[PDB]
Write an enzyme that holds these catalytic residues in place. Structure first.
Site, PDB file in Angstrom:
ATOM      1  N   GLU C  59       8.724  -4.889   0.464  1.00 43.72           N
ATOM      2  CA  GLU C  59       9.232  -4.159   1.624  1.00 43.72           C
ATOM      3  C   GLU C  59       8.110  -3.612   2.499  1.00 43.72           C
ATOM      4  OE1 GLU C  59      10.129  -0.761   2.694  1.00 43.72           O
ATOM      5  OE2 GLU C  59       8.624   0.240   1.452  1.00 43.72           O
ATOM      6  N   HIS C  60       6.862  -3.713   2.048  1.00 48.29           N
ATOM      7  CA  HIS C  60       5.741  -3.741   2.980  1.00 48.29           C
ATOM      8  C   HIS C  60       5.567  -5.117   3.615  1.00 48.29           C
ATOM      9  CE1 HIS C  60       4.063   0.264   2.613  1.00 48.29           C
ATOM     10  NE2 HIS C  60       4.342   0.221   1.323  1.00 48.29           N
ATOM     11  N   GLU C 136      -1.413   4.958   1.344  1.00 48.59           N
ATOM     12  CA  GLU C 136      -0.152   5.680   1.288  1.00 48.59           C
ATOM     13  C   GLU C 136       0.125   6.280  -0.081  1.00 48.59           C
ATOM     14  OE1 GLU C 136       2.780   3.032   2.736  1.00 48.59           O
ATOM     15  OE2 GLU C 136       2.105   3.144   4.821  1.00 48.59           O
TER      16      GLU C 136
END
Lengths: 101, 54, 439, 55, 49, 414
Positions: C59-60, C136
């Site tokens: 999903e990145h 992140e």
């Protein structure tokens, strides 16, 4: 009638004692959570007058001597200042009780 | 909240026995304070009865 | 009107089945919008050991390029048609949704089906996204809350692959290879596990036909196994933190039980109080009045997490390091008062708050569309508001104290402490004070 | 056997107290009888109950 | 940071009944509870007598 | 559902919208034009106090009865506010509307304001001020409104430092007596009938300052968290005007927050210009707040502490080269569809519907349907865009700044 009850109240006030020691009605109350709440809800100048009258009374009981005759705060100028606040405190305490019944 | 943390006797019992910060290291060699305490109360009670019949 | 007249007017969640393993769910409504989402049941629970968190890596890597429609062209067409593209992921599920207008639906199903079946990997972009995931994890070590909850899951499910962390260890992140990620894509995100939802003032048949167009030829044809709830403790002594974060949980029921409905009533009773609420002293829950009168906590959320007939049931409280044990004792007192001396007025209040919370939840595009999603994840259908209204009305106080004695009394919890947490007592104190011997 | 025992006698505190007191009385019964039996069985012969049996 | 946290394993200590990771422990709970509570009950019965 | 909501204006002056959908989510909003711009230097920071006044005693229901009745019927009372307006919203079921209506009537039309509650609420004021200003964006926007107005819009949402504790309930008495007028109230009901709302707001209220000049200036917050927050704002437009809608077109041209989650945001002009110029992580968005008599438009930058000056110079050159007339017409239509998507899918939730519909019906004195709003969005030309961009470049400068100020153009190279 009205002349009977007021005479009884004046006699019991003259023989009550706290007229001699320079106090009023609200000075001689016993304190629970509700009464101490009502003391906390007091105005500031009335609170300072209350603690000064209390400290004069503790002085008078310290040397076991009464103020003189004219320095008695007499009947019918007694300040019922704590009456509506403590009245509402007991009323709201009964409101909590009959809500949590 | 608690009766143990607020009552002025149970504060003494709490800061003695319930919530005492004790080490995580001591062996059976450190039991002997409590062993002398229980021996002492046993001596008190048995001596009390022996003194009742003496 | 009243409950019957208002609850009678609710759309039926028109379901349909595309015949390769796809469940499509439309909710035709009466407002000019659309929310179109794809939910694939793919998280760490489905994942292996040596690919912990590669769905987050997907999903990145999802929006940055496909075989027919490019990645910058993807978001370029999103900004061209005025859409709101969004995605998220749990330890079990994965969601890609689009908030738009219903005429933008064919381009939406176009781009989103290309996202479904024809993704790719770009090696320079995969190194850049590896660096993004490193940065992140760095910037999401900050917020203590999901650190506490991932910490809590890792101590609650020990050894089992259900507490595989959401992003793995760091060395696992820097070795998620191209062949292994394409293997992950080929294994997981394909046939049996996908719900295509569309909510708003839309239509069912044309969306059905164009989904039959875009999902033509998926060719997809052993997982979701149970795990162990151990029950344990972990403590992070870190005195360079301003406040204390402590969570405790027992094993929760899951999805397919009315026990879950009774515990939703119980977690409506207890909840999540937060300190900045207007008025703190005179709140109906006595836990709220106590914890504000003694000013103990900074917040507490007391709640339920329901995985597939499994999961967790518990509490997280944030407090200063001088109000740990008192908060802990009054929390245990509330749990054991729901267990042993459960009254009626608390069940009445919990039912009123749970009804109001669920009705205020089920409104707007995103909560109703995610309700469609999280309904069709495991239920086999979508449950309307009327059936939850009935299952709220089907429980009195006796069943509530039965459920609380069934789950809470004399158990083996899982405690996660984080911060300046020295005043928290040792675990057997929580055990021997967890069940009432009437003090 | 075990889950039945936890279901019956280990839910609330008063039932646990009652069942440990009843276990204490049954242990009183069987333990006193077994202890006296074994004690006078290893002291058979020159024990007083033989002489009371004669006399 | 916290994602690097890997919990150690304790199969040298665990019970052999719950060496089964997949099969959930909503079933053998009362067995362990009644076992240990029977031991403590026997203890308290002997001390009370 | 072929129904629609109903506008009505009660002749003392108040505005009632009524809606009846057959969903049980019943909401009652009540919006009042007695915001923080109606307070002066004597009572600085009183709107935060009066916003936190939920648990008062009312002449008709004491405070314990209020809080326990509301949380026992299960309804939620939220209060949200801006510098112009205060908002009492209550949401519940449609079997929960009469008694919560009566409590909301008590909260509005029954003040008592006793003193111990005020002191405990002062402690609550410091709590909420800490939780508010621990996020930097709100503090930068408060210094921005203090940095652009010489008048009543420079007052804050929250309260300043020294006024915590010093504010007295007698000013609350005076302000509530002479600032809660019947002609400045909007009752927005959703899920309940019209004539019951009409009876209540017809028999149960019965009651009944200059402009804010532009100032021009800068306010700095040396705070040092390696994250420069810089808001560069000029004056734009009052609310409702087609010029202000052209400013909305202008902010959608320049670029807003990331619509794609984790997006490069190519349609934004500022972010692409600076990220094509500066190879550091940052964020640059637009900002516009239009008001009842003035307005504010600018761009808001979040950046590193090393290279904020490159960001501000590249952004200002980009705004100038757009203001000299370089703009593609399908990109202008893409910005118009951005404004369409914003106005539709920002108020499709009942919260946003209640909020913006009540603010317009109290502001514009009417209700406006969404389709004619979309048509008035699409009916905006490009000369207004070029003239608004020239108006921003040529206009006087207001600036709020926070962070390491050692890499910022101050006055000269703005």
């Amino acid at each position: 009638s009205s002349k009977w009850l007021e005479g009884i109240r004046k006699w019991y006030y003259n023989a009550a004692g706290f007229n001699k020691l320079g106090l009023m009605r609200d000075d001689t109350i016993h304190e629970n959570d509700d009464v101490k709440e009502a003391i906390r809800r007091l105005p500031e100048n009335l609170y300072n007058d209350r603690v000064f009258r209390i400290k004069r009374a503790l002085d008078l009981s310290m040397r076991q001597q009464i103020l003189p005759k004219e320095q008695w705060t007499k009947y019918e100028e007694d300040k019922f200042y704590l009456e509506p606040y403590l009245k509402e405190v007991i009323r709201e305490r009964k409101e909590r009780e009959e809500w949590t019944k | 909240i608690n009766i143990r943390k607020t009552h002025p006797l149970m504060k003494i019992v709490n800061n003695a026995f319930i919530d005492l910060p004790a080490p995580s290291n001591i062996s059976s060699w450190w039991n002997f304070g409590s062993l002398l305490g229980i021996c002492l109360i046993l001596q008190i009670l048995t001596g009390l009865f022996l003194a009742m019949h003496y | 009107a009243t409950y019957a007249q208002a609850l009678q007017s609710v759309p039926e969640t028109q379901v349909s089945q595309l015949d390769n393993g796809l469940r499509v769910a439309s909710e035709q409504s009466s407002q000019p919008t659309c929310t179109v989402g794809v939910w694939i049941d793919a998280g760490s629970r489905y994942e292996t050991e040596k690919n912990n968190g590669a769905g987050y890596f997907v999903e990145h890597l999802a929006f940055k390029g496909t075989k027919n429609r490019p990645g910058n062209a993807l978001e370029k067409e999103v900004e061209s048609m005025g859409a709101h593209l969004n995605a998220y992921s749990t330890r079990e599920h994965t969601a890609y949704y689009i908030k738009a207008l219903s005429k933008d639906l064919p381009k939406a199903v176009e781009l989103l089906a290309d996202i479904v079946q024809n993704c790719s990997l770009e090696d320079s972009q995969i190194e850049k996204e590896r660096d993004v995931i490193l940065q992140e994890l760095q910037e999401n070590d900050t917020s203590m809350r999901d650190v506490v909850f991932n910490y809590l899951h890792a101590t609650a499910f020990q050894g089992t692959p259900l507490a595989q962390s959401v992003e793995g260890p760091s060395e696992n992140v820097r070795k998620l290879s191209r062949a292994d990620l394409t293997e992950y894509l080929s294994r997981h995100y394909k046939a049996p596990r996908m719900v295509l939802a569309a909510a708003g003032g839309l239509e069912h048949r044309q969306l059905l036909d164009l989904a039959q167009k875009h999902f033509s030829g998926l060719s997809g044809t052993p997982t979701l196994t149970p795990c162990r709830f151990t029950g344990s403790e972990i403590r992070h002594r870190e005195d360079g933190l301003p406040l204390a974060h402590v969570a405790i949980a027992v094993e929760g029921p899951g999805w397919a039980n009315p026990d879950n409905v009774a515990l939703q009533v119980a977690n409506a009773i207890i909840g999540h109080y937060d300190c900045t609420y207007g008025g703190g002293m005179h709140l109906s829950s006595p836990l709220a009045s106590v914890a504000v009168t003694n000013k103990l906590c900074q917040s507490f959320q007391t709640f339920n997490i329901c995985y597939a007939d499994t999961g967790l049931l518990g509490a997280h409280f944030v407090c200063d390091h001088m109000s740990i044990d008192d908060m802990m004792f009054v929390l245990q007192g509330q749990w054991m008062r729901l267990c042993t001396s459960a009254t009626e007025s608390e069940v009445v209040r919990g039912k009123n708050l749970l009804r109001n919370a669920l009705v205020s939840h089920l409104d707007g595009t995103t909560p109703v569309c995610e309700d469609i999603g999280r309904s069709l994840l495991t239920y086999g259908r979508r449950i309307p508001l009327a059936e939850w209204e009935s299952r709220i009305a089907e429980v009195d106080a006796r069943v509530v104290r039965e459920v609380c004695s069934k789950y809470f009394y004399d158990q083996c919890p899982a405690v996660a402490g984080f911060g300046p947490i020295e005043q928290l007592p040792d675990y057997n104190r929580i055990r021997s004070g967890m069940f009432w011997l009437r003090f | 056997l075990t889950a039945r025992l936890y279901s019956l006698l280990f839910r609330r505190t008063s039932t646990f107290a009652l069942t440990i007191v009843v276990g204490a009385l049954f242990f009183e019964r069987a333990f006193d009888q077994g202890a006296d039996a074994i004690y006078e069985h290893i002291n058979e012969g020159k024990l007083w109950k033989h002489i009371k049996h004669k006399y | 940071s916290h994602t690097d946290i890997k919990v150690p394993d304790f199969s040298d200590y665990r019970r052999p009944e719950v060496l089964d990771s997949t099969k959930s422990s909503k079933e053998s709970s009362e067995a362990r509870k009644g076992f240990s509570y029977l031991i403590t009950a026997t203890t308290t019965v002997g001390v009370a007598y | 559902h072929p129904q629609d909501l109903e506008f009505t204006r009660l002749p003392n002056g108040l505005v009632i919208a009524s809606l009846e959908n057959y969903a049980p989510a019943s909401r009652i909003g009540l919006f009042i034009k007695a915001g923080s711009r109606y307070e002066n230097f004597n009572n600085l920071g009183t709107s935060h106090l009066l916003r936190l006044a939920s648990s008062l005693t009312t002449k008709g229901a004491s405070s314990f009865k209020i809080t326990r009745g509301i949380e026992a019927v299960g309804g939620k009372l939220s209060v949200t506010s801006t510098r112009e307006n205060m908002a009492y919203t209550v949401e519940c079921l449609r079997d929960d509307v009469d008694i919560l209506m009566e409590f909301l009537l008590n909260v509005t039309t029954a003040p008592e304001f006793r003193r111990w509650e005020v002191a405990a609420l002062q402690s609550q004021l410091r709590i909420d001020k800490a939780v508010a200003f621990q996020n930097p964006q709100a503090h930068v926007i408060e210094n921005l409104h203090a940095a652009a107005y010489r008048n009543a819009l420079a007052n804050s949402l929250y309260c300043p430092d020294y006024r915590i504790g010093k504010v007295t309930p007698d000013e609350l008495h005076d302000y509530v007596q002479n600032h809660f007028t019947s002609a400045r109230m909007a009752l927005i009901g959703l899920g309940v009938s019209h004539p019951v709302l009409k009876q209540v707001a017809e028999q149960f209220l019965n009651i009944r300052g200059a402009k804010a000049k532009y100032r021009g200036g800068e306010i700095r917050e040396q705070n040092g968290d390696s994250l420069v927050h810089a808001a560069l704002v000029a004056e734009s437009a009052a609310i409702g005007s087609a010029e202000a809608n052209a400013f909305s077109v202008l902010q959608h041209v320049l670029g807003a927050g990331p619509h794609v989650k984790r997006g490069s945001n190519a349609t934004s002009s500022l972010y692409q210009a600076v990220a094509k110029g500066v190879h550091q992580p940052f964020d640059v968005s637009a900002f516009n707040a239009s008001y009842s008599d003035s307005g504010l438009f600018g761009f808001y930058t979040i950046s590193q502490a090393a290279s904020a000056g490159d960001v501000i110079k590249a952004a200002y050159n980009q705004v100038k080269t757009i203001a000299q007339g370089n703009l593609s017409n399908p990109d202008v239509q893409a910005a118009k569809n951005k404004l369409k998507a914003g106005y539709l899918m920002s108020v499709e939730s009942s919260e946003g519907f209640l909020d913006e519909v009540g603010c317009q019906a109290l502001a514009a004195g009417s209700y406006t349907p969404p389709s004619t709003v979309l048509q008035q969005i699409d009916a905006v030309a490009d000369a207004d865009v070029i003239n608004a961009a020239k108006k921003f470049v040529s206009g006087r400068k207001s600036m709020a700044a926070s962070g390491n100020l050692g890499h910022t153009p101050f006055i000269d190279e703005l």
